[PDB]
Design a protein around this motif. Sequence first.
Motif, PDB file in Angstrom:
ATOM      1  N   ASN A 165      16.145  -7.068   0.704  1.00 52.89           N
ATOM      2  CA  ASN A 165      16.468  -5.587   0.741  1.00 52.89           C
ATOM      3  C   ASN A 165      15.107  -4.911   1.422  1.00 52.89           C
ATOM      4  OD1 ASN A 165      18.873  -4.660  -0.761  1.00 52.89           O
ATOM      5  ND2 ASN A 165      18.253  -6.510  -1.970  1.00 52.89           N
ATOM      6  N   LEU A 166      13.928  -5.125   1.210  1.00 48.26           N
ATOM      7  CA  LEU A 166      12.800  -4.423   1.656  1.00 48.26           C
ATOM      8  C   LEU A 166      13.070  -4.452   3.234  1.00 48.26           C
ATOM      9  CD1 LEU A 166      10.149  -5.286  -1.152  1.00 48.26           C
ATOM     10  CD2 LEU A 166      10.959  -2.807  -0.045  1.00 48.26           C
ATOM     11  N   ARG A 167      13.493  -5.703   3.690  1.00 47.08           N
ATOM     12  CA  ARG A 167      13.389  -6.009   5.220  1.00 47.08           C
ATOM     13  C   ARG A 167      14.460  -5.383   5.771  1.00 47.08           C
ATOM     14  NH1 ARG A 167      13.004 -12.596   4.756  1.00 47.08           N
ATOM     15  NH2 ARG A 167      10.861 -12.758   4.855  1.00 47.08           N
ATOM     16  N   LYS A 168      15.712  -5.323   5.010  1.00 47.63           N
ATOM     17  CA  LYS A 168      16.834  -4.467   5.776  1.00 47.63           C
ATOM     18  C   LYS A 168      16.483  -3.027   5.691  1.00 47.63           C
ATOM     19  CE  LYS A 168      20.511  -7.810   4.911  1.00 47.63           C
ATOM     20  NZ  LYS A 168      20.884  -7.931   6.333  1.00 47.63           N
ATOM     21  N   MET A 169      15.865  -2.358   4.768  1.00 48.33           N
ATOM     22  CA  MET A 169      15.556  -1.092   4.549  1.00 48.33           C
ATOM     23  C   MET A 169      14.618  -0.734   5.339  1.00 48.33           C
ATOM     24  SD  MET A 169      15.286  -1.015   0.481  1.00 48.33           S
ATOM     25  CE  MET A 169      15.132   0.985   0.297  1.00 48.33           C
ATOM     26  N   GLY A 170      13.931  -1.592   6.219  1.00 50.20           N
ATOM     27  CA  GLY A 170      13.152  -1.040   7.440  1.00 50.20           C
ATOM     28  C   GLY A 170      11.517  -1.283   6.890  1.00 50.20           C
ATOM     29  N   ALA A 171      11.082  -2.043   5.795  1.00 49.87           N
ATOM     30  CA  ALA A 171       9.839  -2.033   5.486  1.00 49.87           C
ATOM     31  C   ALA A 171       9.321  -3.288   6.375  1.00 49.87           C
ATOM     32  CB  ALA A 171       9.739  -2.569   3.916  1.00 49.87           C
ATOM     33  N   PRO A 172       7.815  -3.391   6.496  1.00 50.47           N
ATOM     34  CA  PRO A 172       6.893  -2.507   5.787  1.00 50.47           C
ATOM     35  C   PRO A 172       6.752  -1.284   6.839  1.00 50.47           C
ATOM     36  CG  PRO A 172       5.780  -4.271   6.923  1.00 50.47           C
ATOM     37  CD  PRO A 172       7.434  -4.469   7.224  1.00 50.47           C
ATOM     38  N   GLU A 173       7.052  -1.318   7.890  1.00 51.97           N
ATOM     39  CA  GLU A 173       6.828   0.047   8.733  1.00 51.97           C
ATOM     40  C   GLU A 173       7.423   1.353   7.875  1.00 51.97           C
ATOM     41  OE1 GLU A 173       8.279  -2.870   9.573  1.00 51.97           O
ATOM     42  OE2 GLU A 173       9.173  -2.660  11.591  1.00 51.97           O
ATOM     43  N   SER A 174       8.771   1.412   7.681  1.00 55.18           N
ATOM     44  CA  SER A 174       9.214   2.603   6.959  1.00 55.18           C
ATOM     45  C   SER A 174       8.433   2.697   5.294  1.00 55.18           C
ATOM     46  CB  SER A 174      10.571   2.406   6.817  1.00 55.18           C
ATOM     47  OG  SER A 174      11.288   3.694   5.912  1.00 55.18           O
ATOM     48  N   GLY A 175       7.694   3.540   5.118  1.00 57.74           N
ATOM     49  CA  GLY A 175       6.900   4.099   4.014  1.00 57.74           C
ATOM     50  C   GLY A 175       8.195   4.720   3.065  1.00 57.74           C
ATOM     51  N   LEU A 176       9.093   5.404   3.699  1.00 57.82           N
ATOM     52  CA  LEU A 176      10.376   5.491   2.829  1.00 57.82           C
ATOM     53  C   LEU A 176      10.991   4.489   2.388  1.00 57.82           C
ATOM     54  CD1 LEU A 176      11.959   8.272   2.486  1.00 57.82           C
ATOM     55  CD2 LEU A 176      13.191   8.155   4.479  1.00 57.82           C
ATOM     56  N   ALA A 177      11.388   3.429   2.926  1.00 57.84           N
ATOM     57  CA  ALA A 177      11.922   2.121   2.374  1.00 57.84           C
ATOM     58  C   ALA A 177      11.171   1.751   0.917  1.00 57.84           C
ATOM     59  CB  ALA A 177      11.896   1.070   3.505  1.00 57.84           C
TER      60      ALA A 177
END
Lengths: 172, 172, 172, 172, 172, 172
Positions: free
Chosen positions: B150-162
Amino acid sequence: TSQVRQNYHQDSEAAINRQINLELYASYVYLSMSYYFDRDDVALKNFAKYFLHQSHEEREHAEKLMKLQNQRGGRIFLQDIKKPDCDDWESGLNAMECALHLEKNVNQSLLELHKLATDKNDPHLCDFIETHYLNEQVKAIKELGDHVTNLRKMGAPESGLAEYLFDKHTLG
Amino acid sequence: TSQVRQNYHQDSEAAINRQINLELYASYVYLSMSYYFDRDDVALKNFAKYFLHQSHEEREHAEKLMKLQNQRGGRIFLQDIKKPDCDDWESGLNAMECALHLEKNVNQSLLELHKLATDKNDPHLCDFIETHYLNEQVKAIKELGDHVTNLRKMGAPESGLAEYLFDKHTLG
Amino acid sequence: TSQVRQNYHQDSEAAINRQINLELYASYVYLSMSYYFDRDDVALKNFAKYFLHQSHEEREHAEKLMKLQNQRGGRIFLQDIKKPDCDDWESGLNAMECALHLEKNVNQSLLELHKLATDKNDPHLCDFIETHYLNEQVKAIKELGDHVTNLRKMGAPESGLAEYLFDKHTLG
Amino acid sequence: TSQVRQNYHQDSEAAINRQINLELYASYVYLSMSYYFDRDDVALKNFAKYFLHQSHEEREHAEKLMKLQNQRGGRIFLQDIKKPDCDDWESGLNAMECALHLEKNVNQSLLELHKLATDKNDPHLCDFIETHYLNEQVKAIKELGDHVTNLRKMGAPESGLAEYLFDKHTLG
Amino acid sequence: TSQVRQNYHQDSEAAINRQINLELYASYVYLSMSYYFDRDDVALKNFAKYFLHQSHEEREHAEKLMKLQNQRGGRIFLQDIKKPDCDDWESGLNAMECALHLEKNVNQSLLELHKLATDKNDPHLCDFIETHYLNEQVKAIKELGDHVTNLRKMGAPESGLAEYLFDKHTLG
Amino acid sequence: TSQVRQNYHQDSEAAINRQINLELYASYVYLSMSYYFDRDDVALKNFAKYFLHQSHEEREHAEKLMKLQNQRGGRIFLQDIKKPDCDDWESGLNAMECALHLEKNVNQSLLELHKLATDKNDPHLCDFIETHYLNEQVKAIKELGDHVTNLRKMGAPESGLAEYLFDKHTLG
Ligand SMILES: [Mg+2]
Ligand SMILES: [Mg+2]
Ligand SMILES: [Mg+2]
Ligand SMILES: [Mg+2]
Ligand SMILES: [Mg+2]
Ligand SMILES: [Mg+2]
Ligand SMILES: [Mg+2]
Ligand SMILES: [Mg+2]
Ligand SMILES: [Mg+2]
Ligand SMILES: [Mg+2]
Ligand SMILES: [Mg+2]
Ligand SMILES: [Mg+2]
Ligand SMILES: [Mg+2]
Ligand SMILES: [Mg+2]
Ligand SMILES: [Pd+2]
Ligand SMILES: [Pd+2]
Ligand SMILES: [Pd+2]
Ligand SMILES: [Pd+2]
Ligand SMILES: [Pd+2]
Ligand SMILES: [Pd+2]
Ligand SMILES: [Pd+2]
Ligand SMILES: [Pd+2]
Ligand SMILES: [Pd+2]
Ligand SMILES: [Pd+2]
Ligand SMILES: [Pd+2]
Ligand SMILES: [Pd+2]
């Protein structure tokens, strides 16, 4: 560097990290001494229970210092938790005497930490130590001294009857 | 020597002591990673809470093995608890990936322990490992893999929003 | 002159009056920043609610110092409460950054007050500051730093989505 | 400019901002007079309590005007809150007389505000003032006049017995 | 000698014993002044009740210091409790004035004790005094000053009506 | 002189004042012996609790005599409360033996007081002593004798086991 840091000396930060390690070491000593009394050839279950609770408390002491470190903007630095180093602790009386010298050792470190906070004019850290640690140590040391006195007067560690009855009537 | 000991090989006794150290090491890793997310410059409180609970569970895993050692008439032998040795764990995603490799490392050790119990024809110890440890690891590994995905698909670790939203909606 | 006055230095009395004004100034800043988020062209109602509660707390801080002044036999002396003097605070992130520098400013004043109480050997006043003010500031500063970190990582103040979601999930 | 603004004159907007400052000034006067009665050499705790509640009410009056300003699309503009300017208020009777002239001063300002809203044909603002402020002032002024009359008839401010008994039987 | 003693100076031990005697002396003064108001020719039962409660509190203050002495490993040493030495206390107002000078005398002794604990770098004892004694004295002194002020303003000790009504409305 | 005084001899008044001092002395002895068992090198907490309750009872005995003095129109006259004068009381058994000789000493004084009330034909005072004091002493003396007998038969003061078990099973 930390946006929250204010009036928090580098020396205090380092001393808090050393105290965290000592609280974790105390937790480990108590854990070791607890399961000694769980052995089938010792079998004093309230001694075991007493020291296990002590172990859990020390872990809580460490976690509150970790929380404090972050509250003040310091950075936690962890070290190995050394295995327990006690050499003459394998009876009900001797384990209580060990708990006593452990808690006095922790108290000495806390008093040195308070002296440093005082020298660095850190009243928040002084109040933190006084409020959460110094009276806890005084009560712990008093309790252990009480226990040691009773076990001695009852005839421990020779009298197996003494440790049995203390386990039931004081720790039970 | 122990009056209770029966069908308990010396090698198994030693392996149980090594497993106790590994569970305590896992508790320490989780404790370290927990307070990282309590830092003011990270500030993901449900990541912190999640790893702290994990840390408490590992300590319970260690205590049950200490209890088992005494149940079978073995003698607990403790070693230093090494400081956490992770080198690339400082983000929500990277800490979850670390938890994943930690739990797979613990699982590998438990599988090796089960192989030894099988080789020494110790069905009680086999059942103990299967009943209390092997499915716990499978569920833990599955959960962590889910979280990492889930963290990868949401765009982490770049996206702090994720990481913020995962902290609220999955760990909260 | 006061029949209750004892060990209370004139300098401490004056410093307490200055601190009362600063707490009232802090209440006013928070009140101003609160109703900014109540504007129809800002419309973040949990930012508004958060800062309004902060404003009410600061007024309570001032009243407790007024009570203390009378408890010790000093005489309250009031000054104008200056209008808020912030110049770059009009976004969710920037208002939190302002709250952060405000609370650190109040903390610095309290630390200077504690230094004066220490220099004048006033342990009651030292304990009053430690007990009611110093840890409150440390917790407030930690909270605000946490908030600032999350808003930055989520992409504020550019991302209107970030401030909207923070308003809902952290302040809501 | 504001997307919600409708039938709201610039003069009304400015007058609302002036009224906000006056309500905050009234809150400050009441706060000052409250802690006078908390002094050890005055010690009328129900006078203190009475004026403190009055102070809290005035702060609520100010906040409702700030809410109104935003409801109508105006922009809040804050000024210094002047320290209380009373010169002959230091007795139970004299402080009540001050409260009386303060509330009549606030009422006069509200009546002038209503005249402006009427002149600018702003029935919403007229109704807001009538509904939330004008009868509150009439009741406040009547109450204070009642209090002043009783304190005078009982023999205040000479009779310390009078202020003591009024504190107990009317304000208690 | 004591197994629990740590960082506890002989001078502090002695000072704690002197403070125990002073708390017991205060208990005795309050007990004496209480039953004065129980006389048929005085007959102010709430004055009597007020001072009797005060007497019981002082006995509790003494017992907590005895507990502290043992907690720290000191040894309690008791002296005669001197009969009350007041010479101008036989009215409601004069007894309150006596209570006031008694509590300020106790406070002065506690401040001297805190200075000694500070000089001997005993932060536990400093915190004990601050936490359990210094604010209690400040509140007690403030209360008594309030009472003295009201009795004077009401016309005591001449006006028997004043002491009667104070007994009913403030102490009742 | 007192408007309530009737059939109350001056000698009785004086004897009641002497009895008040003796009850206060008894309270002090019991208080001293109580905190002996709170020492870390004695540590019998139910001995401590038992004697502390005894101390509180004696203070109540003194207060009832003070009330009686005023009821009858006598005037309370207080003396120093002497420090405890016991010289061989520092064990569980020896402290109980001291309590026994203390309560018999108080009883002897009460019997002498009753003889005086009888000689002065004061049936109210006779009934007061009989009703509130004489059977209380007989029960107290019987209880202490019971305790002394058990401690001796169990092997105190040599056997530390005896005092420990008595503390748990009789005083607990
Ligand atoms: Mg402990
Ligand atoms: Mg080693
Ligand atoms: Mg201090
Ligand atoms: Mg797990
Ligand atoms: Mg290493
Ligand atoms: Mg199988
Ligand atoms: Mg705040
Ligand atoms: Mg200006
Ligand atoms: Mg009003
Ligand atoms: Mg001015
Ligand atoms: Mg008092
Ligand atoms: Mg004398
Ligand atoms: Mg008795
Ligand atoms: Mg003598
Ligand atoms: Pd040890
Ligand atoms: Pd040990
Ligand atoms: Pd790792
Ligand atoms: Pd890691
Ligand atoms: Pd600002
Ligand atoms: Pd601001
Ligand atoms: Pd005025
Ligand atoms: Pd005024
Ligand atoms: Pd006096
Ligand atoms: Pd007195
Ligand atoms: Pd004796
Ligand atoms: Pd004695």
